[PDB]
Amino acid sequence: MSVAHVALPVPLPRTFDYLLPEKAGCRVRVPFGKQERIGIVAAVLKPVLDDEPVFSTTVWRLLMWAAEYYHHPIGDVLFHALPVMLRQGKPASATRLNTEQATAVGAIHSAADRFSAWLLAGITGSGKTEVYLSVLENVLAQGRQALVMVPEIGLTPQTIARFRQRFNAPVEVLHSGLNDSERLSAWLKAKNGEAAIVIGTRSSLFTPFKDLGVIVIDEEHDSSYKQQEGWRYHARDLAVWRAHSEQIPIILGSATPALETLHNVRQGKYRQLTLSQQHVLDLKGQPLQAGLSPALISRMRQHLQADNQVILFLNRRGFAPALLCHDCGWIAECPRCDSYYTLHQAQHHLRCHHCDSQRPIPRQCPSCGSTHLVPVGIGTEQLEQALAPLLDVDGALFSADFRSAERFAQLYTQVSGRKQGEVILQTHHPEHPLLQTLLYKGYDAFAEQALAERQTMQLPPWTSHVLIRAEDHNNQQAPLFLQQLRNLLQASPLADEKLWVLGPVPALARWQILLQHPSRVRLQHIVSGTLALINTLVKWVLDVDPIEG
């Protein structure tokens, strides 16, 4: 007896069986209903494209783990990983260094014959790039390949040509401007060991290699590494996973490492290799124009009449604001959980998101009585409408998103080194502890303090998180769905009173629930069991280790 468990590109978390008349990871053409479909054999009844498995051993292992960790259909996951042409069932064929810099290269090179996750931490253009290129030389010397990941926007032809000139070997670049013939042919070149280096973005993570020797991720902290639609994987984590299974080094490069990364360094997980005028304006009691203080505008014009350009920064868009007093600096805090109230002016109430408390919007401040209470964290209201006739550190410090401070610290540290340049911050709380750490001690000091505060609040990366989203035209009832799913999560063996669930709370826009637990592995099992059984079902998607925004 022999029968093949085949995975199909469908949103259902299961394998379909078929018969074998006279291996796993090969593509097959199978009947599916009355039509025909391409599938991939997950393991070995109507009967049934490849000679050899289309995924390498370690890439196959990686995808199998990832599907189960992100709780996404094995079918999608596998077909998402393939070149478009292979999805459709077509054939698999196509007719200088200083002291610090040197030390880094050496350190990595001395452990290059096994797994080792290095954080290359250095201020902007201290030449982290130079380390990448030298480490790659040593790996390419040995005749092993390399994967270089950049953010989506980081594949500039300047960067590309600088690589191409450095290496007398073939470099294969997966930019978004390639067609399907080209993408496939490049995928083959990597698989066959013709391509010494592969440079791409997030999806370049799944490209196969004859002998992969090292992985480089530049701008490790960047958002583009987290896929926001469909299969919500994080390319950085999976790269580190892939490096672990293949037993090769990985280099994570950032001038402003994510706190996740720094935590991993403080613990044994990663090892750090390191490389070596502002005005703070108090908005309190000021007359503002378009949220701008006189002192800023005074400084703006003196830069505009000198014929220079002026950049203003705001807090993305659609994010729900907080409420504070423009005169006295009181902020709307939830009295039960010490957390900032999110303002819902459109529904005429104040709402907590860490717990779920309602409260009316007061038209006067309860701490000093001022009528001047303002919303903070708005720049989608066309600042140009107020600027043509003629920021928001608060938005980052008093957000309902617990990550906002970290995002700001990264921005500020980036733009602090981008003549004599002038940086101006506007805030209602110039003397905020965390802000002060950032401004006077630097990013890593901010991070160390921010990270200890995350432990206090039991937030990531001290805990793991899992979001579950629901969208229903009804606006109501869909939250009942999540309430059903909430209770189904309660009793599942593994509550340990540590599992902490936020009951259905409206998104920062759409409903969702949040799951929290110190153990990553325990929270994966809890989701695995409670998801196994479900019935009704209303949109609904599953986001492990979410970036929220």
Q: Are 204 and 198 in contact (CB under 8 A)?
A: yes
Whose Cβ is closer to Zn ion: residue 112's or residue 328's?
328
Q: Is 129 annotated as a binding residue?
A: yes
Per CB under 5 A, residues contacting Zn ion are 325, 328, 330, 334, 336-337, 339, 352, 355, 357, 365, 367-368, 370
Nearer to Zn ion, 225 or 511 (CB): 511
| The residue count for the chain | 549
Separation in Å, CA 218 to CA 155, 228, 336: 11, 20, 42
User: Quick one: 11 or 362, whose CB is closer to Zn ion?
Assistant: 362
Q: Is 99 known as a binding-site position?
A: no
Minimum distance from residue 449 beta carbon to Zn ion (Å): 24
- Beta-bridge mates of residue 289: 292
CB of 325 to Zn ion, least distance (A): 3
**For residue 36, what is the DSSP state?**
E
128 annotated as a binding-site residue: yes
- Using an 8 Å Cβ cutoff, are 512 and 470 in contact? yes
Question: At what angle are helices 478-490 and 520-532 packed, to 10 degrees?
Answer: 120
Q: 384 a known binding residue?
A: no
Question: How far apart are the C-alpha atoms of 429 and 503, rounded to whole Å?
Answer: 32
Q: Are 466 and 460 in contact (CB under 8 A)?
A: no
Do residues 84 and 183 make contact, with C-beta atoms less than 8 angstroms apart?
A: yes
What is the C-alpha to C-alpha distance for residues 221 and 121, in angstroms, rounded to an integer?
11
Q: How many CB atoms lie within 10 A of CB 201?
A: 20
Q: Is 236 flagged in the annotation as binding?
A: no
To Zn ion, the closest distance from the beta carbon of 497 in angstroms equals 20
Q: In this complex, which beta carbon is closest to Zn ion, that of residue 337 or of residue 361?
A: 337
Q: How far is the CB of 111 from Zn ion (least distance, A)?
A: 47
Close Cβ partners of 95 (under 8 Å, ≥ 6 residues apart): none
Our CB check for Zn ion shows the closer of 324 and 409 to be 324
- 26 assigned ligand-binding residue: no
Give start and end residues of each alpha helix (H) in 81-156: 84-87, 99-109, 128-141
Which CB, 94 or 457, lies closer to Zn ion?
457
The CB-of-312 to Zn ion minimum distance in angstroms stands at 27
CB proximity list for 117: less than 8 A, separation 6 or greater: 240, 243, 244, 249, 250, 252, 264, 269, 270, 271
Q: Report the nearest approach of Zn ion to the CB of residue 330 (Å).
A: 5
Residue among 104 and 352 whose Cβ is closer to Zn ion: 352
CA distance 213 to 143: 9
How far apart are CB 358 and Zn ion at their closest, in Å?
10
- Diameter of the chain measured on Cα atoms: 85
Q: How far apart are CA 80 and CA 55, in angstroms?
A: 12
Closer to Zn ion at the Cβ: 146 or 352?
352
Q: According to the annotation, is 260 in a ligand binding site?
A: no
Q: Is 122 annotated as a binding residue?
A: yes
Least distance to Zn ion, CB of residue 450, Å: 21
The three-state secondary structure class of 79 is helix
- Binding site for ADP, by residue number, is 125, 127-130, 162
- Binding site for Zn(2+), by residue number, is 325, 328, 334, 337, 352, 355, 365, 368
- Binding site, by residue number, is 122-130, 162, 325, 328, 334, 337, 352, 355, 365, 368
- Binding site for ATP, by residue number, is 122-129
